[PDB]
Structures are given as C-alpha cells and as structure tokens.
Design a protein around this ligand. Structure first.
Ligand SMILES: *Cc1cc2c(cc1C)nc1c(=O)[nH]c(=O)nc-1n2C[C@H](O)[C@H](O)[C@H](O)COP(=O)(O)OP(=O)(O)OC[C@H]1O[C@@H](n2cnc3c(N)ncnc32)[C@H](O)[C@@H]1O
Ligand SMILES: *Cc1cc2c(cc1C)nc1c(=O)[nH]c(=O)nc-1n2C[C@H](O)[C@H](O)[C@H](O)COP(=O)(O)OP(=O)(O)OC[C@H]1O[C@@H](n2cnc3c(N)ncnc32)[C@H](O)[C@@H]1O
Ligand SMILES: CN(C)c1ccc2nc3ccc(N(C)C)cc3[s+]c2c1
Ligand SMILES: CN(C)c1ccc2nc3ccc(N(C)C)cc3[s+]c2c1
Lengths: 499, 494
C-alpha cells in the first residue's frame, strides 16, 4: 500500500529515479510489469555465450551519467574491437577502409557526401535540444519526412543510399516513416553525425563487462523488496488526496506522487482518473517505436581479424538481411561473435522465417562480405525480436512521424497533476539511449524533490562531470570540409564564370 | 460470468454485432467502458436544442446497412437543407454558387482543379477496397504523404489550397500527417470524390430524426441487461479452454469467442495473454485518430435562407476557425442552427480557449461570410471536443501515417486465435462512418457464426439491398471533365 513515490517501470530510467529518491530518504516502490528488471536492456546468461546483451549495449564518450551510475554500482567497460579494417559493402562488392567512414573518391560524389553530413549538422544547430519545436523552421522541417529531405539534399544516388542506411541504423525506421525535424533533433542531441555514427570517440566505443542488464539488477539489489516484479500498472486515480495506483493482480498502491518511467505510447495500457488532458491523450497514440531484431552469430575464432578486418561491416542493398555489424568477441578474446541488426521493414519481413533460417541467411551474407568460407561455420546463435514485446513496443526508441513533434512535442515531459515523466524519450542528451534513461530518471526524481520543498528549482536539471575513464575527444572539421561547395553551389560557380 | 460471445465496446459496430448474434440465438454480453452506449455518436437532449448530434450524424445514398438497421429500430431520416445557394469564401469575399462544387473561372486554374479531382478518382480505381496494400503502386503511394502528392499534382496555389481543405475535412488530419495511399483508398471506398463530398446524392444528404445516438440506445433496449456500462476491458486471457475477459471494476467474463469493437489503437488499453503476435503488437501503436471539435450555433431563425443561402459555407484560409458548415436546423424550420467543425491543428490551437471565446470567433466568422449582423446574436451554443475522449482517441476515424498501411494494413481484421475484429476501421465500404461500423460488426459476428459451424464461408460477407427511402443516382462526368488536359499537358501542347 503506502509510500512517498510510486515508480512505474523498472528499466534503467525507473531504477535510476528510484535510487535517487531512496538515497534522499524517501520511501519508494517500483512496479515492474515483467518477471525481471532492465526493460529494453536484457543480458542473457548461459554456458555457450557466458553473457550477451540482446537489448541496449553500447556506451561511449559524452554519456557521462550512465558511466557514473555504472561505475558507482561497481561495473567496468571495455572497448569494442576496431583495431583492423572496417568494411563498406555496396553493389555486391566489399571495400576495406580505416578511419571512421568510407572514403569517397569521385570528386562530385565527394562534394555531395561532404555537403550532406555538414548540412545535417548545420540544420541541427538550429534546433534547441530541450525544445526542438522552437527551431525557426520547425513547422517546415516537421511537415516533411526524412525521405523528402534526402531527395532534396542528395545530388548523387551514392549519398542518398548511405544517408538512408544511416537513418535506418540510427532510428530503426524507414526514411519515409520519420519527421525530418525529429530526426535532425535526434542526431543533434546525441552531439552530431560523427559522434552518433562512431565507434572510437562515439556512441559505440564500449560495452559493459558482464552486460548492461547488471545496471538495473544491481539497483534492484540495493532497493530490496521495494521492487515488485510482475506488477503491470492498469489504473491511476488522482481524484483523492493520495494518488492510487492499481496493478493487474489487483494490488493497490497509495503514494504522494508518481513517476511514469515507461515508453510514452505504453501509457495507453493505463486507465486514468480523471482522464488525461487532450494533448497527452492524443500524443500517446501518435508515437510508435522502431523495429529491430538483434542477432549474434558465434564462431570458434574471430577469424575476420586474421584477414585484417575488425568485424565492423556497413552493408548496403535490399537483399542483405543485416545492414551493420560489430565484433562482439569477449574482451579476453574468446566467444568469437558477430553482432548484427535486422532493421525496420526487414525486421517485419524476416520475422516470418525460423531462427535456423535467419542464421543461415546471416552466415551466407557474412561469408560473402568477409570473403570467408569460415563464416559458414557458426557454433552458436542468439537473437531477440523486440517488435514482439508487449512491454517495450519495439526498439531502440520512439520515433515521431511527420507533424507530431511540433503539435504534441511540448507535453512529453509536462507533469499531469502529480504524475511526472521519466523514460529515455524525455531526455535532452542521448534521448533513445541508456544515457538518456538516467538523465530523465534523475530529472523526474528531482522534479518531485522540488515539489516537496526539499530542493530549489535551479536543481531540477543537473550538469554531469565528464568521465575520467572515458574522455571525449572533440568533434573537429578541416577547412576544406567547412568551405567546399555543395553540388548546386559548384553549379552556380560554373554558370557565374560563364560571363 | 458465462456466455458464448463477449463484445468489447458498445458503439454502433459492437451493438450491430451483438444484435446479430442475439438474433441467432447465442448468449452475448457487451462490455462498454463509458456510462453510455454510442461511442463516437452521441445525441445530447435539452430544452434549448431539443436534440443534437455532437458526434457522428450524416447518412446518405449507398450507405444501405446503417439505413436498414435504423429503419428496423423505428428511426426515420430527413434531408439536410441544400435548397438555396452554397457559399465559397475566398480572399475575404463570398461567392455564392449553386450545384455541388465551387466554380473556378481562370482557365489555367480551371484545368488544374479539374485534373486534380479526376486524378484522385483515377488513382483510386487501381486500389482494391478490401486490400489497398495490393494496389500496383502500393509502396510508392504509401511512402509519400498527401502533402507531397498535392505538391506534385497542383500547378496552382488555388487548387492546392482547396485540395488541402478537402483532405482536412474528410479525415481531420493535415495533408503532411497522412499516407497518400491510405487517403486515396479512403475516398475510393466511399465511392469517390463526388460521393464523399456531396450533400444532395452523397454522404451528407441526411440525418436521423431525433439523432443517431438512438441507434445504439435502441439496440441496448433490445438487449436488456446484456449491456454492461462502465466496464472497461483491461485483460484478455486466451491460454485456456474458454476466453477470459476481465474489466476494471474487477468483474470476470468467460466466453467461447470475442469481438473487439473498439478503435484499433484502443487495443493498447488491454493487457493480453498470450502476448499479441508481433505485427498487431506494433500496428496498434501506429494508428492515431484525427482531431476535431464539433460546434453548433443556434439562432432564433434560419435567417440565411432569406438571402437565398442554404447554410453551407466553404471558407478558405488559415485565419478561419472552421472551414466548412452545414445548416443544422430541424426539418420543421425550428431550432435554427449552423454546424461547423474545427479541424486538425486548428482544433489543437483553439482548444486552449474558453467555450464563450470559441462562440465569439464562430459568430464573427459567420457574420462575415453570410453578410449578416444576425449571425452576431446567437441564442444557444453546443460543442464537443473529441480529442479529450479517453475511449475514442479522436474523431472521425483512424488515419494511417506514411508507410503504415502497406506494412501493417493486412493485420487490422486478421483474427487473433478466438478474437475477431469489428469497428468501422475494418470495413471495406464507408470505413470511418456509421455505415462502416455496421458492415464490420455484422461481418465479425458472421466470422464467429462460421467458426461455430452454423453458416458456410460464402456467407461471411453479405451484400445489402438498396434502401427504398434513400436511393442512389449515378455519379456522372461531362465530356470536357474527362478530356481537358492538365496544366503540364497544356504546356506539352505548347
Ligand atoms: C531494444 C534495444 C535498445 C537499444 C539498443 C538495441 C536494442 C535492440 N542499443 C543500445 C545501445 O547500444 N546503447 C544504448 O545506450 N541504448 C541502446 N538501446 C536503447 C536502450 O536500451 C534504451 O534507451 C533504455 O534501455 C531505455 O530505458 P528506459 O528505462 O527509459 O525504458 P525501458 O527500458 O523500456 O523500461 C521501461 C520498463 O517499464 C516496464 N513497463 C512497461 N509498461 C508497464 C506497465 N504498464 N506497468 C509496469 N511496468 C511497465 C517495462 O517492462 C520496462 O521494464
Ligand atoms: C466524433 C465524430 C464522428 C463522426 C463524425 C463527426 C464526429 C465529430 N461525423 C460522422 C458522420 O457525419 N456520419 C458518419 O457516418 N460518421 C461520422 N463520424 C464517424 C462515426 O461516428 C464512426 O465511424 C462510428 O461512430 C464508429 O463506430 P464504432 O462502433 O466502429 O466505434 P465507436 O463509436 O468508437 O465505439 C467503440 C466503443 O468502445 C468503447 N470502448 C473503448 N475502449 C473500451 C474498452 N477498453 N472496454 C470496453 N469498451 C471500450 C467506447 O467507449 C465506445 O463506446
Ligand atoms: C559499424 N558501423 C560503421 C556503425 C556505424 C553506426 C552505428 N550506429 C549505431 C547507432 C545506434 C546503435 N544502437 C545500438 C542504439 C547502434 C549503432 S551500430 C553502428 C555501427
Ligand atoms: C458543404 N460542403 C460542400 C461539404 C463538402 C464536403 C464535406 N465533407 C464532409 C466529409 C465528412 C463529414 N463527416 C461528418 C464525417 C462531413 C463533411 S461536411 C462536407 C461539406
């Protein structure tokens, strides 16, 4: 029954929020729908794999809150393998490259590629992180899909293909599905195209030793009986002095306040009294999550390394089940594995096959891309289709279709009487990620501390000291990168010289 | 506790399903979340208005199923007033017109307008009503918004503005929010642009005497105590011999089968065991409903008729709160009134205002458009904002954003084990309308009859004889309408 704050959801954001409230002397209860904590993070343990992340996994520089929280819980990170060459596979052929991104040799094509990334970052700087709908061209950009924007910016098919793969991999959705204003915000609030797309010095630099699921598990340990598993929340009543929160097994919880730390659309699974105000009522029907199957194929050895390939592949083409891979070998060098994502429409399409049929398609692809028959000899396989999760809705995160973020975006984290909103979707820095889950969790917790008269207003939002274990190198551009013309810019220069 | 079929939702679709099954001899319960039946239809009664439809209201030729069901319940229609001239309000002036659609005088603009309606119907001819994802160009049309399609097709701002208003009014959503495939299907499955937009001989021809809310009320009267009000469903368990359906007030129901007669996305409000299959699990987070406030301003007399205006107004522009109106005066000539809809982003914007502030804006608009100070003296006002409704999600109906219909469309009415799917959104003719609700409820009821062995497969989908009271005249086009070139076509001849 009675407590100070009920937290709905025991994923990273809920658990971080509960921890902060608990550490400040409040009595907190966490109501988790599933028979486990973690949510969109989930670490499988068995003897074949030892451990493996089937949900959220990567952390990197500038993600200072998740790093601090994990370190305080006694966790360590290790570096994803990027020693040897990356591979860009396009038009049925493989092109090895070192450095973060595939080199472009054709000068016209180079101009177009350079301009594209540059412009995304240029547009992004127009977009406030904490209020994307305040960008000067918010409406114009929101009324357009990412597909339209690409068709306008990209004067070569090469640039358009690469841009498309970039969108698909960043947000597990198709370019025609998403708002351009939202996608531009999403990249900017992770610190730009380079930071989001990179391994070394970017979002994919590291994983946790033992798996990310430990974050939520270790917080559960600290809280003890306060976390209630298999308690899906079905009903919230705010008509009386204390908030009443009811679960599916008919248990009743009474609190002063509530944090909702679930994906915004899953708010639909809860019946509200009084009804939600109109903007929130409609917003939660407008905000789907992306589609992805995470797949890990195990080998006797990380044989790609011997061919001077790190295991990173960027794979273009409709026929490829997987569009990107990373080496998922353990830091000690054993349990050789390749991790790959089946994305957006391919997740839907390939879900119809058996596990054994998906494994076969992946190996045949890896064998072609790596030029290696050994890829046809897997020793084990694990996968998770997040699209089938009643209590997630999809992965990685929530996307906004055209027109939604300007009309409804301002209510995402607006309180509803005594209900406050956490969950990575409400973050302002690495929203969509484990980092954003911690930011939103702790911010929602501090909103309540402020409402109770425990902290001043200026302390709701709190800046984070930079990790000393995972330093951020700045993102830099060369002079040519800054000032080279676009394709039409070059065409203008040509017409002008015709005098 | 125990019965043959649980129907979730007591709107028209659920009521029609429950009535059909009950007439077959089966034991039915209807579980309804609200303290009332009707859902997206709702008839308010008070002395000032007598009665008024604050939700779904209009019916017209080709809507044979809603007309038959209502006739059986003892209801009658009357004709929406369209005797006098319609008004098109453009760049701050009123251009009265007779005939269904506002005339265009500039020759270039005329060609652009003409080509646009014609092209919409032409495209719809390649879209199958019962499987729009099977259109030959399905992916291409689904990957574009209606805003992109209008940008390609319309060489004039005039056409593009009127096409935009058309989209806004039909589906209470912005051109950039919706898939081109889905919107083209939507119009085609209502019989085309003329049929969907027309009062005389179209969807807006008629209203029910005493209100559409009576259809659901009278089926509830028929079903006695089988309708359970204030029973929102929260949990459905299919793991056992009988389906178990639990409600929020902790009641338990048990049945051989289930009909879901609620808006698809409102499926999210129910926890399932076992989990729903993947495609439905995601589909139901991908299908929002539109945004509308319905508003009725009452006057002492229908004063517009004296100026030879019927009350129908089409109003261009961002400044207007309402883009279209109809006469809402009762058949007797009393309770004089104008109905208007506040649509899409305007519903969102103007919801912040008070009721009285909305009344003022409407009255000043109508005064300008009708050219009468009499519009400034309302005797009464009623409105309903459907955006606030937890158990509707919006009005009129569900729209599909780009990419959704091709990827998820086929799952909408696919049965999940012992759950069958009703609700206007699953209909194949006038989906989105009261008519679609009856089509879908009855079909979902017959799917269950066939699963039970009581009827053969070829009886699941049943045709409907044409109403004698509301017969349909054919949709015609003139020779010039068919063969005049588009703007780029006239350019190619130059
Ligand atoms: C799925 C996924 C996510 C992901 C990714 C790859 C995949 C396949 N890769 C990532 C990565 O490499 N690095 C990273 O930082 N993030 C990555 N992501 C995203 C990341 O996993 C998520 O952003 C993060 O896990 C989300 O945390 P958050 O705490 O905000 O949200 P949640 O995990 O979904 O937890 C919500 C919990 O609430 C429970 N729930 C749902 N409904 C109810 C009700 N009605 N009542 C009670 N509890 C409820 C859920 O069960 C869940 O535990
Ligand atoms: C809102 C609206 C609708 C409308 C319109 C104008 C407005 C402002 N104009 C129309 C018109 O002029 N002509 C016409 O034919 N249609 C018009 N529309 C749309 C029309 O009203 C709808 O297509 C139709 O009413 C929909 O019927 P349907 O039976 O398919 O669906 P519903 O009315 O929403 O009924 C659903 C019921 O289910 C209940 N519910 C919801 N969730 C639950 C749960 N969890 N458990 C139990 N019951 C639930 C709802 O409360 C509702 O009663
Ligand atoms: C191998 N290469 C070049 C790349 C390039 C960009 C990438 N972007 C991501 C963005 C988010 C994410 N999550 C798991 C959230 C995973 C990845 S993996 C990834 C791999
Ligand atoms: C007055 N004129 C010319 C028009 C033209 C088209 C129209 N379209 C509608 C479409 C649906 C609808 N509903 C209430 C669902 C109402 C209307 S009102 C309407 C009025």
């Amino acid at each position: 029954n009675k407590c100070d704050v009920v937290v709905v959801g025991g994923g990273i954001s809920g658990m971080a929020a509960a921890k902060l409230l608990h550490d400040s002397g409040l009595n907190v209860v966490v109501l988790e729908a599933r028979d486990r904590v973690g949510g969109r993070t989930y670490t499988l343990r068995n003897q074949k794999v030892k451990y493996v992340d089937l949900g959220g996994s990567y952390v990197g520089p500038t993600q200072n809150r998740i790093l601090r929280l994990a370190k305080e819980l006694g966790l360590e990170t290790y570096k994803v393998n990027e020693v040897e060459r990356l591979i860009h596979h396009v038009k049925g052929k493989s092109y090895p490259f070192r450095g973060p991104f595939p080199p472009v040799w054709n000068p016209i094509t180079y101009l177009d590629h350079n301009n594209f990334w540059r412009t995304m970052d240029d547009m992004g700087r127009e977009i406030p992180s904490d209020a994307p709908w305040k960008a000067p061209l918010a409406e114009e950009w929101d009324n357009m899909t990412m597909k339209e924007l690409l068709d306008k910016l990209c004067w070569t098919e090469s640039a358009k293909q690469l841009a498309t793969l970039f969108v698909n991999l960043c947000v597990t959705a198709e370019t025609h599905e998403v708002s351009a204003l939202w996608f531009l915000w999403y990249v900017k609030q992770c610190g730009g195209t380079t930071r989001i797309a990179s391994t070394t010095n970017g979002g994919q630099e590291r994983k946790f030793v033992g798996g990310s699921g430990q974050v939520s598990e270790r917080i559960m340990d600290l809280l003890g009986d306060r976390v209630k598993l298999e308690r899906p929340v079905i009903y919230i009543d705010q008509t009386r002095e204390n908030v009443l929160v009811e679960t599916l097994n008919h248990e009743m919880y009474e609190a002063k306040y509530v944090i909702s730390a679930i994906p915004p659309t899953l708010g639909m699974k809860i019946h509200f009294n009084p009804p939600l105000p109109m903007m929130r009522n409609q917003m939660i029907t407008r905000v789907p999550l992306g589609s992805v199957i995470k797949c890990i194929v195990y080998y006797k050895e990380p044989f790609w390394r011997k061919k001077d390939y790190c295991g990173t592949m960027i794979i273009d083409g409709e026929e490829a089940p997987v569009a990107a891979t990373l080496d998922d070998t353990k830091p000690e060098g054993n349990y050789a594995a390749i991790m790959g994502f089946i994305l957006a429409h391919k997740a839907r399409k390939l879900a119809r096959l058996t596990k054994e049929e998906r494994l076969k398609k992946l190996c045949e692809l890896y064998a072609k891309v790596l030029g290696s028959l050994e890829a046809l000899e897997p020793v084990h396989y694990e996968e998770k289709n997040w699209c089938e999760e009643q209590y997630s809705g999809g992965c990685y995160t929530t996307y906004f279709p055209p027109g939604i973020l300007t009309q409804y975006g301002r209510v995402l984290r607006q309180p509803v009487d005594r209900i406050y909103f956490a969950g990575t979707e409400t973050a302002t820095h690495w929203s969509g990620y484990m980092e954003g889950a911690v930011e939103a969790g702790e911010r929602a917790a501090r909103e309540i501390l402020h409402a109770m008269g425990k902290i001043p207003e200026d302390e709701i939002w709190q800046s984070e000291p930079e990790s000393v274990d995972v330093p951020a190198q700045p993102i830099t551009t060369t002079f040519l990168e800054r000032h080279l013309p676009s394709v039409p810019g070059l065409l203008r220069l040509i017409g002008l010289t015709t005098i």
